[PDB]
Amino acid sequence: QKDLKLGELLLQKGWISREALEEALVEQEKTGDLLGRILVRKGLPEEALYRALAEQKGLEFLESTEGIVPDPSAALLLLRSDALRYGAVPIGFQNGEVEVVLSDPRHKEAVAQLLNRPARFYLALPQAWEELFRRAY
Amino acid sequence: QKDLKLGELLLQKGWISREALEEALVEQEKTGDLLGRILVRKGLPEEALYRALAEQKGLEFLESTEGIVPDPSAALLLLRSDALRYGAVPIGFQNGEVEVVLSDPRHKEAVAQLLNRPARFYLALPQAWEELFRRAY
Amino acid sequence: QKDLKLGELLLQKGWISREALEEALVEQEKTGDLLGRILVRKGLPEEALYRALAEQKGLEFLESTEGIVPDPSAALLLLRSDALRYGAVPIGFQNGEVEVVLSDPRHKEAVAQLLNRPARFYLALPQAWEELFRRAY
Amino acid sequence: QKDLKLGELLLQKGWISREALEEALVEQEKTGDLLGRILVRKGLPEEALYRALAEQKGLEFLESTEGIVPDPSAALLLLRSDALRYGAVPIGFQNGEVEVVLSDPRHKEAVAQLLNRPARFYLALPQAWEELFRRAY
Amino acid sequence: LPRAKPLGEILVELGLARPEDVEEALQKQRRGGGRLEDTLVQSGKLRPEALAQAVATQLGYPYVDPEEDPPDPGAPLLLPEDLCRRYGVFPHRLEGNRLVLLMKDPRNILALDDVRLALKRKGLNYEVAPAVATEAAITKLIERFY
Amino acid sequence: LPRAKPLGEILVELGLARPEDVEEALQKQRRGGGRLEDTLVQSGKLRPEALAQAVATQLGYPYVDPEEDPPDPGAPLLLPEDLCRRYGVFPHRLEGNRLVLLMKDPRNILALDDVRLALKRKGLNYEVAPAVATEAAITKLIERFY
Amino acid sequence: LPRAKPLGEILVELGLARPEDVEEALQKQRRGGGRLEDTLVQSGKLRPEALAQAVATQLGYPYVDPEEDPPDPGAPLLLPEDLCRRYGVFPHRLEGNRLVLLMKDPRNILALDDVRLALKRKGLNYEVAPAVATEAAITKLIERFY
Amino acid sequence: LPRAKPLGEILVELGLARPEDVEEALQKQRRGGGRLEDTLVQSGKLRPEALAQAVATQLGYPYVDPEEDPPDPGAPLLLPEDLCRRYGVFPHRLEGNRLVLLMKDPRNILALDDVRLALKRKGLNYEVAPAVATEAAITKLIERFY
């Protein structure tokens, strides 16, 4: 349930409008999805979402489309289409370890997935995540 | 159930009348409410309680809810009446760290309420701790 | 189980009349009762017994309840009559051992108290136990 | 069965008379008792056997009845007469410890006695064994 | 009270010492040259607890109990034994350069500040975030790290 | 170097400072001599996010959370706590010659130069790309490793 | 210290000696170079156990048996092994500036002042509470805990 | 001291040696100036068997094989290897002040004196709790622990 406050940090960074925050929050309370993956599209860039969120939830920062690698061994838990609406996907796979891309670390329902092996959460650019989603699973 | 005994430290530092201790212990068995929470009202001058309790459990001797802000999600975990006889509305709620500011960590029957997960204890004045409910539930 | 000859320190350290030992030793040998509690009152001071048992069993002699402070972890649940009749309270921890204060470490029904955890046993006089009765619960 | 010929060394060392060796050795093969033990008192000072055992078998070199303390907790494990022929008194007891002190760990007829629990061999005289058994058996 | 007012009188407010003890200590500091707290300790008036309970409260500083409270093992790299002894202080919890300057008497702000500056002489660029423990516990705490 | 855009003006482009705040900081470069980047942090002409984001925007940097973002054991070996705290920095993951350096101001060349000599004399080839984080975590990253 | 009664004389009061043993042993130490506390038994008069229980008694302190009483490790490290061995003493309970010192001879001021200095180097400004023990028992205590 | 029944002649009386070997040992006395005792074994004249029983006979000693008898690992440090091997001795179980010193000849007073001093200067209070054993096996035992 906690982070160093999504929405608010994004507003402080000049990344979202006050309206993006509030409408997104209404959608959060209405749907169960949380504010972060909701702020985006309501005014927030996903890049901005992810950058602030990385600071907010204990995440190690991830790479661009020239960096992060797809792997069904880990990704077979979150479908490219779930990954797409979520904004998140597992990264690579060791027999004893998975690295994971988050979107919104507060999205209670979704952040509960991804970890398809002992694993660690990370976060960065949506460009990377989209290409990753579509190849990973 | 380990402590330096509320009511005894209180008498030792000039914090209570002896009668506060004796009657509050009776009410503490007959109603089951915490001795300390009861002592304030039975003849203990507020801060006097918390300072003894902080000595009893080796706790930080704290400031008010200006800084010690409660958690409404955690507050709604307990019936506020459970939390009130307990002597605190919880702050935070980690699996190995609920933050609790009890009015009497000594009282063996009400002290046993609330902590579905163990607490790390700290403690300030009752003004703060009752405000802690006003600020959460 | 080995010891350093219960009864011998009592004589050698000038703690008893030899009579305490011989009568008591005979009762241990003939009745099956234990030499520790058997020895006292036979020409053996209570203090004298406990200092011998303390050394003989690798245990420690205790002073009055200014020293033998009960541990509420158990003492608030413990009946005052248990503190008195076993002459015993389980206390704190050290290494993995929890202290057992006892009226007689040879008297295994009392050493039994505590033993959910490893323990070193500690020793004291009937008055230590009556005072502990009076203060512990 | 094997060792550095327990009991023959004694002749070499002047510890026994020639006659002691010849008689005891005939008795060894004839009776099953072994030369080491059989030689005592055949022209063999018992101590000299222990010098030989300390040398030919390697048992911890211990002492006579004025040295080694009897203890029925263990002595009752083996019959005094056979034990005397065997050459040992089992001494002392902890749940995890018994000492066995033996004059003839060659004894083809019964060498395996006593050390069938957390115990090991030590070395001392029949003089001690008989007296220590009579004092505790 | 306790609040701003000197140790002794604030001890009265928490039942730690009486108006009489604090007045005699004031009479003593007239030649003693110390603070009410120092003459209360010097005159044999204070309990280690008396100090800790009222002084922390006095300045909005925490009263901490070192048997449990953050006996930070890296904090002696900022306020070492040398300095611990100099002011009757101990380095509870580091915060950047900051130090929870556990002290027998934070009422003596200038002593907290002298330590602050002395922290630079030993380690990081200070910033005292002071506290007090039972004076006896401050002593035991210091012993635990040297 | 680093160069690219000026920090002050970027703070403003992000809507995280007034040009008026940038100018006062510049006046500090005339009223003390620190450069715009030093003067902004010294004069408080940066919304916290302005500094961090503006530099991340100005030059190009990652957003991390140092509480968990790997405090590589080589990091306390690499850059000492006194220096680290003075310049608001602490190494995270060491990457061969390179470094992800936690830093309050990834553009401030003076701060970076003092850091550089330490990161040059020990561990790395400097090759530093400082990271963005809340000061609370910068503080904790420096604080916890030494 | 405290000054103490003569050891032999306290043994007389306890029914453990004649004044003849006290003075004869005293005349022995006057030539021998040892203490009355040693010569009561070195002169072959009084039992060393009697002497051991009696010296603390001689001072108003208890008999404490070293094979029983807990040698709180801080205490033997507080007062070094060589220094302990030197006086026939072994450290126990600590509090504030206090140390219980279990001695074959509680009267032995060489310990108490050299101990004082050791305690002060550690951080305790002395307040030793001598207690007495059988020399062999503290010998074993000394052998077992530094 | 020690005294009792002289080793030379008893080595012979036991039927384990000739008077001629006592004399050749004595020739070492004539060619070195030591005692019988010493030379009976040091010059290699009287049989080891003679010494096993005779040394044991002269003063009262046990005889034991060092390769097996519990060679108390701390005891080897009680007598530094060259002060151990030169005299054919090895420290076994310690008994408080006492040492079970296993030696080729516990009556060889020259070798024994060098060892005794080592067992007080380097060792315990000597108070030997001795035994007899060939030098070869003893030496192997010494080597195993130093």
UniProtKB/Swiss-Prot annotation, chains A, B, C, D:
It comes from the Bacteria. It is found in: Cytoplasm. ATPase component of the type IV pilus (T4P) that plays a role in surface and host cell adhesion, colonization, biofilm maturation, virulence, and twitching, a form of surface-associated motility facilitated by cycles of extension, adhesion, and retraction of T4P fibers. Acts as a molecular motor to provide the energy that is required for biogenesis of the pilus and the extrusion of substrates generated in the cytoplasm. PilB ATPase activity is also essential for T4P extension while antagonist PilT ATPase activity is required for T4P retraction. The ATP-binding site is essential for assembly of pili. Belongs to the GSP E family. Homohexamer. Interacts with PilC. This is Type IV pilus assembly ATPase PilB. It comes from Thermus thermophilus (strain ATCC 27634 / DSM 579 / HB8). The gene is pilB. The chain holds residues 163 to 299 of 889 of the full protein.
Swiss-Prot record, chains E, F, G, H:
It is found in: Cytoplasm. This is Type IV pilus assembly ATPase PilB. Homohexamer. Interacts with PilC. Belongs to the GSP E family. ATPase component of the type IV pilus (T4P) that plays a role in surface and host cell adhesion, colonization, biofilm maturation, virulence, and twitching, a form of surface-associated motility facilitated by cycles of extension, adhesion, and retraction of T4P fibers. Acts as a molecular motor to provide the energy that is required for biogenesis of the pilus and the extrusion of substrates generated in the cytoplasm. PilB ATPase activity is also essential for T4P extension while antagonist PilT ATPase activity is required for T4P retraction. The ATP-binding site is essential for assembly of pili. The chain holds residues 330 to 475 of 889 of the full protein. It comes from the Bacteria.
